[PDB]
Amino acid sequence: DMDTLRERLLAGDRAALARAITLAESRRADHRAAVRDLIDAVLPQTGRAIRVGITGVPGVGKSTTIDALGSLLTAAGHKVAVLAVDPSSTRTGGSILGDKTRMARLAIDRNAFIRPSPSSGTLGGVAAKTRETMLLCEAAGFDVILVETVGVGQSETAVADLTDFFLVLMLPGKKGIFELADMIAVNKADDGDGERRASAAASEYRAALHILTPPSATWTPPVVTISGLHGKGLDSLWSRIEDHRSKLTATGEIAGKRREQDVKWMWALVHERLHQRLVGSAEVRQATAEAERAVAGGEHSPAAGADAIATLIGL
Amino acid sequence: DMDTLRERLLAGDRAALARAITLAESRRADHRAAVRDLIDAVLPQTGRAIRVGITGVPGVGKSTTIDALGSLLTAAGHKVAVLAVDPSSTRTGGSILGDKTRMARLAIDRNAFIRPSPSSGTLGGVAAKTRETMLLCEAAGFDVILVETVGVGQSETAVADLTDFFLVLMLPGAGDELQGIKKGIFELADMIAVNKADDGDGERRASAAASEYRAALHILTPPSATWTPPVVTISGLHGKGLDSLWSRIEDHRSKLTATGEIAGKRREQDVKWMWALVHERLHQRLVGSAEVRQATAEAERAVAGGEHSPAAGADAIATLIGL
Ligand SMILES: Nc1nc2c(ncn2[C@@H]2O[C@H](COP(=O)(O)OP(=O)(O)NP(=O)(O)O)[C@@H](O)[C@H]2O)c(=O)[nH]1
Numbered sequence: 344d345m346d347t348l349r350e351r352l353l354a355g356d357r358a359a360l361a362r363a364i365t366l367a368e369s370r371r372a373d374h375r376a377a378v379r380d381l382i383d384a385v386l387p388q389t390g391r392a393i394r395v396g397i398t399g400v401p402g403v404g405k406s407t408t409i410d411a412l413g414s415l416l417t418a419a420g421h422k423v424a425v426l427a428v429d430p431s432s433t434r435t436g437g438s439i440l441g442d443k444t445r446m447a448r449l450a451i452d453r454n455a456f457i458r459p460s461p462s463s464g465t466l467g468g469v470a471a472k473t474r475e476t477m478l479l480c481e482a483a484g485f486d487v488i489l490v491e492t493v494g495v496g497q498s499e500t501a502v503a504d505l506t507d508f509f510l511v512l513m514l515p516g517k518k519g520i521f522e523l524a525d526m527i528a529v530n531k532a533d534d535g536d537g538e539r540r541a542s543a544a545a546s547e548y549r550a551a552l553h554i555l556t557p558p559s560a561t562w563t564p565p566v567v568t569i570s571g572l573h574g575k576g577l578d579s580l581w582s583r584i585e586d587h588r589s590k591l592t593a594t595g596e597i598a599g600k601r602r603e604q605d606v607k608w609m610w611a612l613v614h615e616r617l618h619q620r621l622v623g624s625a626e627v628r629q630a631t632a633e634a635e636r637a638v639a640g641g642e643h644s645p646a647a648g649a650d651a652i653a654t655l656i657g658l
Numbered sequence: 659d660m661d662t663l664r665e666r667l668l669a670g671d672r673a674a675l676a677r678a679i680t681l682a683e684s685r686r687a688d689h690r691a692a693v694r695d696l697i698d699a700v701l702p703q704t705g706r707a708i709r710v711g712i713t714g715v716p717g718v719g720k721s722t723t724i725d726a727l728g729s730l731l732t733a734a735g736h737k738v739a740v741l742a743v744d745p746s747s748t749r750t751g752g753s754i755l756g757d758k759t760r761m762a763r764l765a766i767d768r769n770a771f772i773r774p775s776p777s778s779g780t781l782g783g784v785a786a787k788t789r790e791t792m793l794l795c796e797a798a799g800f801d802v803i804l805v806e807t808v809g810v811g812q813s814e815t816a817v818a819d820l821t822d823f824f825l826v827l828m829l830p831g832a833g834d835e836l837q838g839i840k841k842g843i844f845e846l847a848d849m850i851a852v853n854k855a856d857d858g859d860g861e862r863r864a865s866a867a868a869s870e871y872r873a874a875l876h877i878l879t880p881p882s883a884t885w886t887p888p889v890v891t892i893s894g895l896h897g898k899g900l901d902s903l904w905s906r907i908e909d910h911r912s913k914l915t916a917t918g919e920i921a922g923k924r925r926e927q928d929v930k931w932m933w934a935l936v937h938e939r940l941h942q943r944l945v946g947s948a949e950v951r952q953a954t955a956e957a958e959r960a961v962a963g964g965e966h967s968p969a970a971g972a973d974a975i976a977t978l979i980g981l
Pocket residue numbers: 399400401402403404405406407408445493530531532533569570571572573
């Protein structure tokens with residue numbers, strides 16, 4: 344019953360939230376429709392959260408840093424969602440149980456809620472389904488939404504376009520990442536000597552970033568040092584994110600960014616549906632893959648590809 | 659007469675080139691269809707050119723630098739096309755004459771060929787049209803294709819994705835007067851050229867700016883890349899730095915041709931323009947009548963206004979199409 348699902352979701356019921364999400368992430372069109380009204384209906388309870396995107400190479404203490412940061416926040420009374428975006432999920436069907444235990448503490452904290460990357464046809468669709476899932480979390484009372492890049496593909500721009508603040512975690516020992524960053528945090532600044540060489544590296548990143556013009560005069564990206572493993576610097580790291588929130592709330596820039604992202608996700612969903620017509624049948628898929636291949640092979644022009652494809656999919 | 663038009667264009671007939679371009683860039687579907695087979699037919703004669711994207715804030719000296727650079731190139735026997743991408747041409751009908759006071763020499767040099775930005779429903783569509791225009795030029799025998807950003811809008815990615823090499827022009831001045839690299843431009847840039855480095859005080863301030871940019875880039879550029887983006891100083895107005903600027907561009911082409919990276923990048927740009935065009939058709943369908951544009955805009959307004967969800971907007975949109 345969707346009325347009950349809604350009410351219990353609004354009441355903060357973890358099982359109702361998990362179930363609404365399942366339907367919103369579904370690759371069945373009938374399921375997705377079913378919960379469109381529900382998300383729309385609870386939209387006025389969304390948005391009262393800090394959305395942070397977090398990235399860094401595999402091997403930088405990302406999951407560790409998240410487990411620790413998230414635990415600090417649940418201890419102080421926050422309810423924290425951790426959602427993944429993984430471009431490989433455009434080729435897998437998604438994951439039933441995901442990989443919760445990379446974050447040992449959060450994985451068992453009922454003040455947390457951890458979800459793996461949804462499946463969809465395009466990266467745009469994966470990210471858009473993630474926005475819808477963020478809205479459900481918020482409506483169920485999660486006030487911190489962490490969205491992390493997982494895998495090796497290009498998810499950084501999408502994660503940044505899903506959140507208010509984009510956090511880059513770096514080691515002390517992809518170009519585009521720097522200009523997405525609202526803050527860099529040099530990790531593994533261990534009390535024993537790691538602090539010296541991460542403080543060095545932070546001066547290098549801090550020096551270089553002076554040459555980039557930030558998108559707003561309201562905020563100048565800082566570079567900091569932390570230890571994710573021993574919990575160092577995590578409190579001040581969070582206080583900078585809070586400070587960003589207060590400043591860009593006062594100027595209306597948090598809201599203006601979100602409005603722009605939302606329209607972007609709307610168009611991404613329109614384009615996902617179009618893409619779904621490419622796999623409408625084997626014949627349509629064959630012919631459209633060969634149009635694309637022709638263009639990618641240099642054999643016919645982009646415009647000829649485009650018209651072949653447009654005819655095939657009824658456009 | 660398309661058959662002669664083709665043969666004339668392949669022979670380097672400039673009037674034929676102008677004519678095919680006006681069809682390719684047309685906002686009339688019947689027109690665009692007409693020349694589709696022609697471009698497809700001349701494809702094996704395209705690609706033998708160096709394609710350079712050029713950007714910079716208004717006032718930095720872009721038209722001046724292109725005028726001086728293109729002229730050097732034409733004196734050496736190159737045929738030089740200068741095309742534009744203007745994001746505001748999604749809101750205009752495009753320009754008929756374009757702006758050429760700025761390129762006084764090239765505007766009369768019959769070894770050059772200058773075109774204003776085409777008009778389309780979406781920025782992707784404008785840029786896609788510029789790609790087809792680049793192909794027609796190449797087929798007519800142009801071996802240097804310069805593509806510039808126009809105005810202050812967000813067209814840099816589009817130009818970067820239309821060319822082999824992306825050149826950023828910057829103002830001189832360091833310390834508190836350092837211009838700063840606009841959000842997005844750092845990752846696109848294959849070289850920075852600090853312009854207005856005029857004999858005397860210009861060159862001092864430009865050299866200062868340069869070392870600043872140069873050190874930052876060293877820090878931020880991963881070492882894997884076959885190419886390390888240089889920073890250089892030039893004066894577009896007084897001709898300084900231009901042979902050196904271009905020698906670096908040729909070095910890029912030689913290196914990345916060896917590793918197959920020029921051809922690999924083009925093939926992914928091409929697929930991207932193919933999809934842009936697919937999405938421009940979709941968009942056209944959403945402006946096909948007053949009632950539908952109204953409904954579309956209302957849907958988008960609902961999402962931007964925080965009144966309805968993105969997926970609910972997209973569902974309303976999708977109905978209006980029959981999708
Ligand atoms: N010395 C030190 N080691 C750390 C720190 N944070 C993480 N590590 C270590 O780095 C290794 C990789 O950690 P992990 O957090 O899984 O990195 P990740 O690959 O980015 N996480 P994910 O599972 O999402 O990919 C682990 O063995 C972990 O103990 C730190 O602050 N200091």
